[PDB]
Amino acid sequence: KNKCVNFNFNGLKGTGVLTESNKKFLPFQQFGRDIADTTDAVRDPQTL
Amino acid sequence: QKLIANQFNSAIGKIQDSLSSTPSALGKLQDVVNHNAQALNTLVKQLS
């Protein structure tokens, strides 16, 4: 966390900084999105 | 002279109220702000 790295969550390749998020997610919701339809919030597949 | 100085001061005192009460008195300047933001939202939103 807090470092520019390459992340790969189930095939969502990308580059960015991963920080802890307090965004409430409904148990059905897996990933968030912003206005430009780009992923800005992810759920770790192993550690919830 | 005394009357003319009074008329000027009353005229000044109404300007403070006129702009405050009327909402669309500064519509020309608010148009500059709105057009700039609307263009950038359209540019961002057009990424989907």
XYZ file of C-alpha atoms in Angstrom:
96
model
C 0.000 0.000 0.000
C 0.985 3.634 -0.581
C 3.332 2.963 -3.509
C 2.974 3.093 -7.295
C 2.794 -0.552 -8.415
C 1.151 -2.786 -10.993
C -1.978 -4.477 -9.679
C -3.815 -7.420 -11.245
C -7.119 -8.377 -9.590
C -8.709 -11.283 -11.479
C -7.503 -9.769 -14.736
C -8.135 -6.043 -14.113
C -4.639 -5.087 -15.203
C -3.702 -1.542 -14.254
C -1.239 0.860 -12.666
C -1.836 3.024 -9.614
C -1.560 3.414 -5.853
C -3.683 1.145 -3.646
C -4.954 2.661 -0.394
C -7.482 1.623 2.234
C -11.062 2.533 1.320
C -14.031 3.275 3.598
C -16.533 3.159 0.719
C -19.465 1.078 1.912
C -20.077 -1.802 -0.491
C -23.231 -3.842 -0.620
C -22.326 -7.563 -0.340
C -23.318 -7.974 -3.991
C -21.233 -5.038 -5.231
C -17.732 -6.119 -6.266
C -16.056 -3.052 -7.848
C -16.827 0.667 -7.918
C -16.734 3.037 -10.875
C -16.443 6.751 -11.611
C -18.059 8.990 -14.243
C -15.646 7.916 -17.002
C -16.517 4.229 -16.431
C -13.081 3.452 -14.985
C -12.430 1.281 -11.929
C -11.536 3.321 -8.836
C -12.476 0.813 -6.109
C -11.698 -2.907 -5.971
C -12.416 -5.831 -3.648
C -9.516 -8.161 -2.990
C -10.560 -11.696 -4.026
C -8.850 -13.458 -1.077
C -8.806 -10.925 1.774
C -12.231 -9.273 1.836
C -24.151 70.889 -2.239
C -25.711 69.352 0.873
C -28.632 67.857 -1.056
C -26.381 66.508 -3.821
C -24.141 64.724 -1.310
C -27.234 63.092 0.198
C -28.567 61.841 -3.138
C -25.204 60.291 -4.005
C -24.958 58.440 -0.680
C -28.479 56.975 -0.894
C -27.732 55.811 -4.436
C -24.588 54.036 -3.182
C -26.498 52.391 -0.335
C -28.934 50.719 -2.712
C -26.200 49.043 -4.784
C -25.211 46.864 -1.816
C -28.819 45.688 -1.605
C -29.594 45.413 -5.326
C -26.889 42.872 -6.161
C -27.470 40.901 -2.965
C -31.219 40.424 -3.437
C -31.313 39.901 -7.203
C -29.966 36.404 -7.971
C -29.211 36.800 -11.697
C -27.488 40.192 -11.506
C -24.070 38.576 -12.114
C -25.321 36.189 -14.788
C -22.670 37.301 -17.275
C -19.754 36.296 -15.038
C -21.383 33.054 -13.886
C -21.703 32.120 -17.565
C -17.909 32.120 -17.909
C -17.597 29.668 -15.020
C -20.385 27.378 -16.217
C -19.213 27.096 -19.832
C -15.699 26.149 -18.763
C -16.851 23.416 -16.372
C -19.446 22.057 -18.797
C -16.800 21.687 -21.512
C -14.437 19.790 -19.208
C -17.177 17.472 -17.958
C -18.098 16.701 -21.574
C -14.450 15.981 -22.363
C -14.154 13.665 -19.340
C -17.553 11.991 -19.798
C -16.756 11.275 -23.476
C -14.228 8.619 -22.360
C -16.910 5.923 -21.981
